[PDB]
Amino acid sequence: KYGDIFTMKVFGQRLTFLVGPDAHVPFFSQGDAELSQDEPYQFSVPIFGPNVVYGADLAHRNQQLKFIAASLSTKALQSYVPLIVKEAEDFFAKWDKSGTVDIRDALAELIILTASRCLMGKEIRENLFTEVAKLYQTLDEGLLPISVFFPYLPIPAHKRRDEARLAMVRMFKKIIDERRANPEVKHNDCLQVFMDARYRGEEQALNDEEITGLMIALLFAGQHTSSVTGSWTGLLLFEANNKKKFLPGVLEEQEEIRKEFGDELTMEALNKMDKLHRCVKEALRMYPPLLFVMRKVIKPFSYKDYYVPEGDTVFVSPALSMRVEEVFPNADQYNPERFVEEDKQAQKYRFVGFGAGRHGCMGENFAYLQIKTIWSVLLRNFDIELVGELPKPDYTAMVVGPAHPCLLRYTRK
Ligand code: HEM
Ligand SMILES: O[C@@](Cn1cnnn1)(c1ccc(F)cc1F)C(F)(F)c1ccc(-c2ccc(OCC(F)(F)F)cc2)cn1
């Protein structure tokens, strides 16, 4: 079991898989001239919309990615964290003195609530949430297996998808027009950043399609990644064995933070929760939400004496790569504290839950803050137990989440 590169031919296409840190090197270390995202990620274009992300040419795409990075910078996150905390506290306040919850359903709800606020702004959060959630659900239901091959197939799900997108644009057109009418009012959200964004060489702001598309993209990200890793984080920690070993260190750490900082959850406090961080990271190691990341090969390369020609699609599976024993001792065991030592390793591309290199996750820090917020609030206010077996990965959506039901029992402290 030290195969680390192999090829299928399927549908007349050569798929080449790269497993483990050495094989990863040609995937992550190269750039846009050598590897292309366009063709593998076609499926996303009619979801986010035309001329947005993988539907834009490189020139525009590279600038859109800089806008996104700005919207999720450290500075921006400082101002979002209060919002993220409030939403979480309001949400879990609604909970009874004890009961049972599907954690996956719950965190999907909370994360899309929070995202609507930070991404899309107060107006939408407070006036139009239900409309936005419904429109998103429709978008998401137009992502079928067939859609990765034929995105613009005129089947019903695709029609409703396209209609839902256009509706979403119309909704934001109103908010944007109102904001341009009153442009001296500052707003704390990604929308503001996208409204102030300008392409270079041009007095051109993004139109409403592009702005809406960038926000669909980021909403999609949170629902497809953060919400699942957020669920696993708890499912894994509050399994009886894992709970025994690891929860003490976590609860201790929360109390040490409260003594230095107080009851208030802040950027600085969350940034100190190392043991909780590693719990999230280990859930991510074991059940990464993205099955594959992919590129079309433009410039051929060899790894060992294995030749990968132009026109190949190369794949990395974070799931596979991070179950390799040579890299991760007891690969199939839950051990958060592996990352004390693992984090000190010099060799690149061992952990690839957030990808790496030029196109690594720009939302990593946001994800950690969102997920640590959730579990900080939960840990501080409840005693929690896993109901039954640890769920198995469910591969039906275009996302690998824990299979329903994902039940936790809670009792208030
Ligand atoms: C724990 C949750 C998350 C995981 C596991 C995750 C994972 C990843 C991975 C593996 C990539 C690389 C994709 C590729 O190479 O093609 C990526 C890219 C990206 N992620 Fe995330 N992500 C997460 C959360 C987020 C969040 C919350 C956002 C923002 C809303 C976000 C925004 C992005 C963006 C914009 C990229 C594009 C990188 C590029 O093409 O340059 N992610 N993410
Ligand atoms: O990488 C994403 C997802 N993401 C990244 N971070 N959080 N979510 C992405 C990238 C940039 C964004 F702005 C928003 C995004 F959501 C993405 F571009 F849409 C994306 C890329 C690849 C996949 C993907 C994952 C697994 C797949 O399985 C392969 C198979 F379907 F079997 F053929 C197929 C596709 C999903 N989303």
Numbering used by the authors: 74 to 486
What did the published study say regarding this structure?
Acanthamoeba sterol 14α-demethylase (CYP51) is an essential enzyme of the sterol biosynthetic pathway. Here, we report catalytic properties, inhibition, and structural characterization of CYP51 from Acanthamoeba castellanii. The enzyme displays a 100-fold substrate preference for obtusifoliol over lanosterol, supporting the plant-like cycloartenol-based pathway in the pathogen. Cys434 serves as the fifth (proximal) axial ligand to the heme iron.
VT1161 was selected for cocrystallization because, in this work, it was found to be the most potent inhibitor of Acanthamoeba sp. Additionally, it has been previously shown that VT1161 does not bind to human CYP51,59 indicating the desired selectivity. The asymmetric unit consisted of six very similar protein molecules, with the average RMSD between their Cα atoms being 0.22 Å. Each protein molecule contained one molecule of the inhibitor bound in essentially the same conformation, except for some rotations of the very distal portion of its long arm (trifluoroethoxy group). Within the active site, the N4 nitrogen of the VT1161 tetrazole ring forms a 2.2 Å-long coordination bond with the heme iron. Due to the lack of helices A and A′ in the structure, the trifluoroethoxy group of VT1161 is partially exposed to the solvent and has a higher B-factor (up to 90 A2 vs 8–10 A2 for the tetrazole and β-phenyl rings inside the active site). At van der Waals distances (<4.6 Å), the inhibitor is contacted by 16 mainly hydrophobic amino acid residues. The positions of most of these residues are similar to those in the structure without a bound inhibitor, except for Phe293 and Met471, which adopt different conformations, and Tyr114, whose side chain ring rotates ∼ 90° yet does not lose its H-bond with the heme. Overall, the binding of VT1161 did not cause any substantial rearrangements in the protein backbone. Thus, the strong inhibitory effect of VT1161 on the activity of A. castellanii CYP51 does not appear to be a result of some inhibitor-induced large-scale conformational change in the enzyme. We surmise that, instead, multiple interactions between VT1161 and the protein moiety impede the conformational rearrangements that are required for catalysis (e.g., acquiring the substrate, redox partner recognition).
